[PDB]
């Protein structure tokens, strides 16, 4: 594939939709969208391990991390496939989001189809927190909207 | 053994989890879940082509047809991948979903996972119901609940 598509969704006023583009396939992934019910300021905006909502955003479990490394922010070279960062909504709750990132892939071992894209609470501290929490998720909170991210036209 | 889920929903009361498992990549899928809030009686239950929900269940496109067939049921040479035929639901609404299909897969050029699983209004007719239609769609008309397949833990 070279487009996939992600409708986030939650229990709350958080929604958005978030498309893809990879039109080469070792070429970077452009992340483009909107996003909006959000608290003013930075959200964390990861891709969870399972495309699995059967209990809601939790159930999409950890990150995706398939390499095992800790966890970063999208421009370091110690980060999981799936920390692509923070998205930032203006003061009418709005995220205007466009990402390029190398890292997430629309195939192959780093594939994002399937998985879950997830807007959390507040903001990723990047690796850089200063506690445990923070080398392992970031500490950006819990999960206001997601999607399983799927296969575009 | 590489597993998908999808959770099924849509404006209406219709609402389900579907669990797939292939344990080979050669094998057969698996698949089964629950579907409640259906009418008593037949169906269609359908892989259509996008991950994309972006418009509701309208946004998931044509059935997954990859191989230019004409619509058949599950059991026929003639098909769309996609076709998996009718589930039934009991007279309390409920559809009790036990499948082993050949055709689908969790890999490769029929690879399901990012597509969309949409449960329909009618009965599909397999293609045997004596119209153009039926041979396209199966005549199962609306879809009342879809959702993107994911991958599972």
Redesign the interface.
Known sequence: ?TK??C?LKGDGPVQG?INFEQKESNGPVKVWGSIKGLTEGLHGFHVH??????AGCTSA?PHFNPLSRKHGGPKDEERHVGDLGNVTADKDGVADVSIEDSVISLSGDHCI????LVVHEKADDLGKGGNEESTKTGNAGSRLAC???????
């Open positions: 594939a996939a598509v409708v939709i391990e399972f495309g699995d909502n059967t479990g189809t399937g998985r879950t999607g399983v991210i799927g296969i575009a036209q």
